[PDB]
Paper text:
[name] is a bacterial/archaeal type IA DNA topoisomerase that catalyzes the ATP-dependent introduction of positive supercoils into DNA. Both enzymes are large (>120 kDa) monomeric entities that consist of a helicase domain containing the ATP-binding site and a type IA topoisomerase domain fused on the same poly­peptide chain. The two parts of [name], the helicase domain and the topoisomerase domain, are structurally connected by the latch, an insertion in the helicase subdomain H2.
Here, we report the crystal structure of [name] [name] containing this minimal latch at 2.9 Å resolution. To gain insight into the structural basis for this differential effect on activity, we determined the crystal structure of rgyr_minlatch. The minimal latch formed by residues 387-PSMRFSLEELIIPD-400 emanates from the H2 sub­domain and retains its short β-sheet, i.e. the first and last four residues of the sequence. Typical of type 2 β-bulge loops, the minimal latch in rgyr_minlatch forms a hydrogen bond between the NH group of residue i (Phe391) and the carbonyl group of residue i + 5. The twist is a result of Phe391, the first residue in the β-bulge loop, rotating its side chain into a void that is normally occupied by Phe401. Deletion of the globular domain entails the removal of Phe401, apparently prompting Phe391 to fill the void and maintain van der Waals interactions with the methylene groups of Glu850 in the T3 region of the topoisomerase domain. Apart from Ile398 in the β-sheet, the location of which is the same in all [name] structures, Phe391 is the only residue that makes any interaction with the topoisomerase domain.
Residue numbers in the entry: 2 to 1041
The structure:
């Protein structure tokens, strides 16, 4: 622990508790002074301080009682899915059962109703078919005790049985009612006035047919009509409804959704019960993609003699399908078609009378999408790449989405085992194949291998082994995993490759649920930081106890209207008085309640110092609720990044946390003290936000004097059939004589890949953009899974990055110029590089075509520079011929070096290498003399300041862009026509006051030394408390 305090972290009183006790899982000193109690609940009870821990105590008791009852009557323990479902039942929550198909769904809801019946609560079970009503009734009465009241309603009942159901209904003398969806459709008003405690529906599509059916269920769980009218008016208006907290609804559970609720009516569940009817887009796929370079039927015949059984063939058009169906019928293949007798032929394929089925590639074709039997469909073959027609031209592009659907029919989660499938493409067109490969890489991150690198025997052995493992009864391994990030955009990228099935609205945040082979995966976004230092108390929010400093933190509040952020516990914004506050206290409370339901929790913030501090704040808060907390750092937001991050799962690195604390303290103490001294002088407030800001302003102010001092003389000479020459001073002669000419060969190496500083400088200069916007574009590209982590100080490139470079060069047929370079061996992160072998031109094509739609042209250009920078670093050295020409101008000898030829290509393909006209050993005439003055020391630009900051050891990748932009926001600097930064009159006299009284606390030497100290703290090489002592004495000198 880092010995800090948080203002709402106590799990029992909701008040202030220290860092250490939360880590140990204990309440604050006020609630329970004992460090090591036998039981926290009993100790709180004895001291008569038991306020909120009673809820968790009853929650675990209720869940354990539920699970105990399940094992007693079912005989088995709760699976991972049913473990999460049970933890929500005892909490009174309503949800959608997000899981693969199986008998575990109906059995759980049947067991849940029995458990509620044992508590005296009444339940209702709805089934699509009257047959399912009878079977579940049979399962109930076999297991239910004789005391339990179970009644049913279907069409073929006894006359006495129908009357005994109704009579038990009107007298309210029942515990479980088991009727079909037809009963709900025909008895809306009869159920509309009764309030049940649990409703289980097996088919959601029977209810989606009528909006009245949705309202009937909401009436059944105890929602007033006055609430429905306001909610329906809000959603039809396009907004989100807020519930009355005093409402006590029932429990609604949905089993499986075919996910076709086009109407707005299902969205009423999201606003009225905080759960989403799931559009189960399952991304759990394991498919090998192989391309065969021709459409030779002989190879197809040979391939089918290997695959033998369970084969689908997709033709582009019906005529091609008819030809293939006839061709394989003349040959002795058991084949069937789908375009005429779809129903009969597919059933023959299911049972085994047909080995091969032929269809047509439609985006939502019945064979392409409307079939689901992976246990039989093992191999999918495409007789041509599926394609679409894009815009009004005849331009033909691959239909990647149709390919993903058709190939996906061979792989899904079946009986808890994710089966393996094979997709084979017969494509003669190389360019169409290349277009599909990158499209599949962007969406599915799945490669396509060539024919010569595929072992058919091993692949089919893998296919049959996986299915034979799925068909036998499996031992459950499912776990419920929680993923916590801080950025909403990162969560959206996660939902694209994990697959958003359902979504829950938990107080201030939204939690999405997805199906994976390991079980259920939950993920949510924090929307920024959770804690920050309090403004008042002690030394500007830092207390002192036992000679050590304790930082005090409180939850962040962000006003949604004006955006002002503050830490004080206030109902309204202190600047604009609005009450539309993004309150992180509710975010923390939501995470604590989620931590109860999940088996495992992983914090996945950014992999830097700022992200690590956020991770510890969340983990220490969530520790009193669950002990299953760990940390993962993702360097790319992709499937590969998530897998690699989980493989390096670890605990919280406290050295990173302490580095953040000392960095924030330095800005707080130095800034507040300088702001106060500047407050009295120049009137305004918050004029200084750290030591680094003052130092950089000093560079800009003093640059004006030395820029003017450095004015030397130059003369522009344009020579006939030659380049322009800049010579010093006034040149009188009109003839330039070449006296020496040497021509040489060299191998020019490329520039290293981008770091945060180098990317900020080069991109800002070339795109005429400020360094703050470039940083934001870098952040978006990383958060959307296009580049590696953008806050980096290293040029290190891993073998995987080199592997990406080789893959692209192999694609473009220029594999020969590949040259793997690891660059630096030092560095926490890699350099800024693309994560997939896609260049900006292909990205722009898929943006113009709409495969992706949230990248602006500024994002494209920034990505283009990064991609070219990285591949230049991975390309072979360029061979060039140059010349060293010595010329005499006015008796002055001047040597010029210029590249004249490019003998061998290399990284010059990605970064252009300028050549110059060849020089001869003769005299040259001057056409024009452009006389002008240029200063030896040029002024500052935004790119140059960042470049100057790193070379001087000032600033960090997390601060470079921030430091520059703060000067503009304070009005200390401006930009002229040529985008040079220039100090304002206010900025000069602000720096003038500091440089004349407080140079010791502002000077560059102090800034660099403190930065190196804090970097040593980050590595754990210097003491955390000692560093704070040094900061205290420095500010205490000027405090008076
Ligand atoms: Cl065969
Ligand atoms: Zn307490
Ligand atoms: Zn053969
Ligand atoms: Zn406000």
């Amino acid at each position: 622990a880092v010995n800090s305090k948080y203002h709402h972290s106590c799990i029992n009183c909701g008040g202030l508790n220290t860092d250490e006790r939360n880590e140990r899982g204990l309440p604050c000193e006020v609630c329970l002074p004992e460090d090591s109690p036998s039981d926290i609940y009993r100790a709180l009870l004895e001291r008569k301080t038991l306020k909120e821990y009673r809820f968790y105590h009853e929650f675990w008791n209720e869940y354990e009682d539920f699970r105990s009852f399940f094992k007693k009557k079912f005989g088995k323990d709760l699976t991972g899915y049913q473990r999460l479902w049970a933890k929500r039942i005892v909490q009174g929550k309503s949800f959608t059962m997000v899981a693969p198909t199986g008998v575990g769904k109906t059995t759980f809801g049947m067991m849940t109703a029995l458990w509620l019946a044992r508590k005296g609560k009444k339940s209702a079970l709805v089934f699509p078919t009257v047959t399912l009503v009878k079977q579940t009734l049979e399962r109930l009465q076999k297991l239910a005790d004789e005391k339990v009241k179970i009644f049913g309603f279907y069409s073929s009942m006894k006359k006495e049985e129908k009357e005994k159901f109704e009579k038990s209904f009107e007298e309210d003398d029942y515990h479980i009612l088991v009727f079909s969806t037809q009963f709900v459709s025909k008895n809306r008003e009869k159920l509309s006035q009764k309030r049940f405690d649990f409703v289980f529906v097996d088919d959601v599509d029977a209810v989606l047919k009528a909006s009245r059916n949705i309202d009937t269920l909401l009436m059944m769980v105890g929602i007033p009509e006055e609430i429905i009218r306001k909610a329906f008016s809000t959603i039809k208006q396009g907004k989100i409804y807020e519930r009355p907290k005093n409402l006590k609804p029932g429990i609604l559970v949905v089993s499986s959704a075919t996910a076709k609720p086009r109407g707005i009516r299902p969205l009423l569940f999201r606003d009225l019960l905080n759960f989403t009817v799931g559009r189960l887009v399952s991304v759990a796929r394991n498919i090998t993609h192989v391309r065969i370079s021709s459409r030779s039927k002989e190879k197809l015949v040979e391939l089918l003699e290997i695959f033998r059984d369970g084969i689908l063939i997709f033709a582009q058009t019906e005529e091609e399908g008819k030809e293939l169906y006839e061709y394989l019928k003349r040959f002795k293949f058991n084949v069937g078609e789908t375009w005429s007798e779809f129903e009969k032929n597919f059933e023959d394929f299911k049972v085994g009378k047909i080995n091969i089925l032929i269809g047509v590639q439609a985006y939502y074709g019945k064979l392409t999408r409307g079939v689901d039997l992976p246990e039989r469909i093992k191999y999918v073959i495409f007789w041509g790449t599926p394609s679409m027609r894009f815009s009004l031209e005849e331009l033909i592009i691959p239909d990647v989405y149709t390919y993903i659907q058709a190939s996906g029919r061979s792989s899904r989660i079946l009986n808890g085992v994710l089966v393996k499938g094979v997709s084979v493409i017969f494509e003669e067109d190389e360019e169409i194949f290349e277009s599909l490969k990158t499209r599949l890489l962007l969406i599915a991150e799945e490669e396509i291998i060539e024919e010569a690198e595929a072992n058919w025997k091993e692949l089919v052995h893998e296919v049959e082994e996986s299915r034979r493992r799925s068909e036998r009864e499996l031992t459950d391994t499912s776990r419920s995993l929680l993923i916590i990030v801080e950025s909403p955009t990162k969560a959206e990228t996660l939902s694209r490759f994990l697959g958003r099935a359902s979504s829950r609205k938990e107080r201030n945040i939204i939690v999405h649920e997805a199906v994976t082979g390991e079980g259920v995966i939950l993920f949510t976004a924090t929307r920024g930081h959770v804690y920050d230092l309090v403004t008042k108390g002690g030394i500007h929010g830092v207390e002192e106890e036992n000679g050590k400093f304790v930082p005090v933190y409180n939850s962040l509040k962000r006003c949604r209207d004006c955006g002002y952020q503050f830490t004080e516990d206030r109902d309204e914004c202190p600047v604009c008085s609005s009450k539309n506050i993004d309150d992180k206290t509710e975010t923390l409370r939501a995470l604590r309640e989620i931590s109860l339901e999940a088996d495992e929790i992983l914090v996945a913030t950014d992999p830097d110092v700022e992200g690590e501090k956020i991770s510890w704040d969340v983990t220490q808060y969530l520790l009193p609720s669950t002990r299953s907390l760990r940390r993962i750092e993702m360097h790319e937001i992709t499937r590969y990044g998530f897998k690699k991050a989980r493989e390096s799962v670890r605990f919280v690195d406290f050295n990173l946390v302490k580095a953040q604390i000392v960095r924030r303290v330095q800005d707080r103490w130095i800034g507040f003290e300088l702001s106060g001294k500047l407050q009295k002088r120049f009137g305004r407030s918050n004029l200084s936000a750290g030591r680094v800001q003052s130092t950089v302003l000093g560079w800009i102010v003093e640059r004006e004097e030395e820029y003017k001092k450095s004015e030397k003389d130059f003369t522009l000479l344009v020579l006939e059939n030659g380049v322009n020459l800049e010579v010093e001073g006034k040149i009188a002669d009109d003839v330039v004589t070449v006296v020496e000419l040497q021509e040489a060969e060299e191998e020019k190496n490329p520039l290293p890949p981008y770091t945060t500083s180098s990317a900020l400088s080069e991109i800002s200069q070339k795109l005429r953009l400020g360094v703050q916007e470039v940083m934001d574009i870098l952040q978006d590209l990383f958060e959307k899974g296009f580049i590696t982590y953008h806050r980096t100080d290293s040029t290190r490139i891993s073998l995987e990055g080199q592997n990406v470079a080789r893959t692209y060069l192999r694609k473009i047929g220029k594999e020969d110029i590949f040259m793997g370079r690891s660059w630096s061996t030092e560095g926490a992160h890699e350099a800024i590089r693309p994560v997939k072998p896609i260049d900006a031109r292909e990205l722009e094509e898929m943006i113009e075509e709409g495969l992706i739609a949230d990248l602006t042209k500024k994002h494209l250009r920034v990505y283009e520079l990064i991609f070219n920078r990285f591949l230049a670093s991975q390309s072979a050295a360029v061979k060039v011929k140059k010349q060293i020409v010595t010329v005499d101008v006015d008796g002055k000898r001047m040597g010029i070096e210029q590249i004249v030829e490019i003998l061998r290509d290399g990284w010059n393909l990605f970064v252009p290498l300028t050549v110059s006209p060849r020089f001869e050993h003769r005299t040259y005439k001057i056409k024009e003399k452009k006389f002008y003055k240029k200063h030896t020391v040029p002024l500052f630009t935004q790119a140059s300041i960042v470049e100057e900051m790193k070379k001087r050891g000032i600033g960090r990748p997390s601060t470079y862009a921030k430091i520059v932009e703060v000067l503009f926001r304070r009005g200390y600097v401006y930009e002229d026509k040529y985008k040079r930064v220039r100090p304002t009159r206010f900025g000069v006299m602000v720096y003038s006051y500091l440089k004349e009284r407080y140079e010791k606390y502002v000077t560059e030497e102090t800034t660099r030394r403190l930065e190196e100290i804090m970097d040593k703290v980050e590595r754990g090489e210097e003491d955390y408390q000692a560093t704070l002592r040094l900061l205290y004495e420095e500010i205490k000198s000027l405090m008076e």
